[PDB]
Amino acid sequence: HMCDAFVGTWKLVSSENFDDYMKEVGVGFATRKVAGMAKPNMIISVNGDVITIKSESTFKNTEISFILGQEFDEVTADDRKVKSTITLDGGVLVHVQKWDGKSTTIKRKREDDKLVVECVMKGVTSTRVYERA
Numbered sequence: 203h204m205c206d207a208f209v210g211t212w213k214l215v216s217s218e219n220f221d222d223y224m225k226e227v228g229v230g231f232a233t234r235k236v237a238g239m240a241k242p243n244m245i246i247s248v249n250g251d252v253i254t255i256k257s258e259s260t261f262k263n264t265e266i267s268f269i270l271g272q273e274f275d276e277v278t279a280d281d282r283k284v285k286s287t288i289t290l291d292g293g294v295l296v297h298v299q300k301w302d303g304k305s306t307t308i309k310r311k312r313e314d315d316k317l318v319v320e321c322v323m324k325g326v327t328s329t330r331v332y333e334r335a
């Protein structure tokens with residue numbers, strides 16, 4: 203029951219400062235422009251201790267599966283090869299990605315009927331708000 207309130211299908215309804223966040227992570231111009239237009243569907247499911255997060259859009263379809271606290275290899279949508287660890291901290295899903303001596307943190311939070319995604323790299327944050335599909 204660890205992620206019960208996160209499970210579902212969610213659709214992107216707002217974004218703020220995502221272009222600048224992508225710049226900070228190193229995404230190139232053309233990818234930023236095309237990816238920034240996407241309106242992904244985020245599909246979160248749990249089966250035993252394994253959590254799966256899928257993101258489907260015209261830009262790219264991605265999928266990660268993981269166990270909380272257990273590091274895994276991820277190829278991000280912008281093709282970084284990162285080491286990811288996802289934990290639950292006080293009801294917030296906290297995803298840290300490490301690569302090339304850099305780090306970024308992506309937090310997912312349930313707030314009212316929304317799922318709010320906050321990602322941060324150095325001082326640059328973006329907030330992406332999802333609602334139930």
Ligand SMILES: CC[C@@H](C(=O)O)n1cnc2sc(C)c(-c3ccccc3)c2c1=O
Binds near residue numbers: 262278330
């Ligand atoms: C929002 C934080 C984080 C995440 O959703 O887990 N996250 C982090 N970095 C990047 S770079 C990039 C190109 C996407 C991206 C993926 C699919 C569709 C559009 C953009 C992305 C991303 O989605």
